[PDB]
Amino acid sequence: APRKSVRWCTISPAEAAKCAKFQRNMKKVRGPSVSCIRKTSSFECIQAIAANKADAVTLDGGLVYEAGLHPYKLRPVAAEVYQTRGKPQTRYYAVAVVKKGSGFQLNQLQGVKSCHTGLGRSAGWNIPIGTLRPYLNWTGPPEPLQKAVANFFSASCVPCADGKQYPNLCRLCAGTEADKCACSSQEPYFGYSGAFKCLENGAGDVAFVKDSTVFENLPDEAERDKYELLCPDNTRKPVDAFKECHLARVPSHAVVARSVDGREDLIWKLLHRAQEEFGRNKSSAFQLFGSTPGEQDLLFKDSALGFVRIPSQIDSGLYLGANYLTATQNLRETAAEVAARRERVVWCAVGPEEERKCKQWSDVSNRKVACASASTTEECIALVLKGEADALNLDGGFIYVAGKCGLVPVLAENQKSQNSNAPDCVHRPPEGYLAVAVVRKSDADLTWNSLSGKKSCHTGVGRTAAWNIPMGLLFNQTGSCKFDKFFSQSCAPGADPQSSLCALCVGNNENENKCMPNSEERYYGYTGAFRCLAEKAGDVAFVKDVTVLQNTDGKNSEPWAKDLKQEDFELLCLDGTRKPVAEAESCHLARAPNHAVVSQSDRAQHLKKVLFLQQDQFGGNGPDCPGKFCLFKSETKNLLFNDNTECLAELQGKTTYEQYLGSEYVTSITNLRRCSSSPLLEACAFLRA
Ligand SMILES: [Sm+3]
Ligand SMILES: [Sm+3]
């Protein structure tokens, strides 16, 4: 029954004392217990926990990142919350404080003495040095960045700096013999405050800090008018306009632990009660977010409202978020590397057959596109979220989540629709596709009204054509959320494998991977679903009219198909009517949005431009399609895009997810969520807040 005490990793004599007072205040409270291990730095604290020598340490963004790097695998368990001047947050602005009349503009920093909180943290280093990178003249990765900055500022006070090799980086540090440049509250200038003083005492001319710092020691407006903000555009404004003025915005500091056996469950209890037993003015016997006049920021960041518990799928990268990981990694990749990465495009494949495919496209384009894959649509969405990946094709069903995660649909898949297949596609308004209800005419007693407890084949859950529309419908008639209970059994990969919904699925040829949601599941997607009913594994196939068409009457030359015939298939129609496969126009459940590639709005454009190129060299009329590669072709296997894709088009202004899918569906979908919820939709829920 008992569960251990949280080992908290301190960093200087200061921290312990504080940690101390906490542990005891804690027990005096009859709350989960604590303890303090003792090392010398945040970087150290990391390793310690790594080797289960301890369990937690509140970390800076910059440090979180390192903490997540391979060997250690640390996770932002909890997040602090601060000022904002109004509505509380987990994001903070990174600035530059200089004394009125110092003159120099941010682009002029060469020659100035500068202050820094410590090595590698956001506000003081990560953000700043990257900004000024364009004036460093530093070979890149091969040549130590320390020497750069070293030689960029006349001298300075860099905590954790390797002042032996680059003494200039700790010159300014006012610290005793070895306390000098120490990487803890033993160095007076270490930390936000730290830096501010380093500027206040005239040591430096520019401090890189937290947006609240200044107000965090200048209680009197007057004093506050003595200083300013170096805005990235080259002007200077007042300390309280960080809002416009700032080098960057960066995510909150966080309580980190182990990828595995972190004891998350003990940590969060500790902090939760802590907010509650000694946070914002609750008692007077102790104060979490209160530190000595000697040193600030002990254990947590001073005057932090409190914490928020991060959801678990969140692993650092993500926590950070794109914008930050790129630049952070940017300070350790060559310019070349850099510009390289900016000009290309990494596509995110789901499943092997696809990666293969992405591999082709790669070699065919001469690397203008490269590849990033994984086992689940979710998965490739995250990757874009993290920045290992730029983009991929989504179906409206994933559009919705992607959109929830802040991504935007760039180009649309436009079928060789029918009117006039001239370069109309490009401008042609995406006209949609019909999700139909399919079964064996053979089996006619059957209707839409009959599907209670029968066999169903779904292309994928969380997808439109199949899942979304029908279940949504069924949701409208059953008044109940037990999706697995409706059809006797089912085939719908990405469902819980030990459920009926993944009952009728066949895993790859060697029957492995039952229910995964990708092409190995021979019953996955459009085709796979049509066959699941074809091989009669089930009775009702939720798919697109077109679907049937593509594999019957000798279309797909695959055995299971081969002798399939249009006439053999009937459409269930919303009024109990059944029709042949052609009357779809009047025999469908509804109209689905065409699929849509997507990425971070950021690259929105460049994404568009090279794909447009790629599509002029390899899609519908690809001068080289039947020749050395066809982007839009994949052996009735739908690799990357639908096999009938004429091309990809302009969204006719639909630029926000809602716009593209439209209110209704969107609403249709948000209704279902009342039934269920996914991991990533949740994740984002907290990140985008
Ligand atoms: Sm910081
Ligand atoms: Sm689809």
Curated annotation (Swiss-Prot):
Subcellular locations according to the entry: Secreted; Cytoplasmic granule
Binding site for D-glucose: P430, N594, Y660
UniProt binding sites for Fe(3+) 1: D60, Y92, Y192, H253
Top-rank taxon, per record: Eukaryota
Binding of hydrogencarbonate 1, residues: T117, R121, A123, G124
SS bond list: C9-C45, C19-C36, C115-C198, C157-C173, C160-C183, C170-C181, C231-C245, C348-C380, C358-C371, C405-C684, C425-C647, C457-C532, C481-C675, C491-C505, C502-C515, C573-C587, C625-C630
Gene Ontology CC terms: early endosome; extracellular space; plasma membrane; recycling endosome; specific granule
One protein family per Pfam: Transferrin
Keyword set, alphabetical order: Disulfide bond, Glycoprotein, Hydrolase, Immunity, Ion transport, Iron, Iron transport, Metal-binding, Osteogenesis, Protease, Repeat, Secreted, Serine protease, Signal, Transport
Subunit composition and interactions: Monomer. Found in a complex with LTF, CLU, EPPIN and SEMG1. Found in a complex with MPO and LTF; interacts directly with CP, allows Fe(3+) incorporation into LTF and activation of CP ferroxidase activity.
Protein name per Swiss-Prot or TrEMBL: Lactotransferrin
Source organism of the structure: Equus caballus
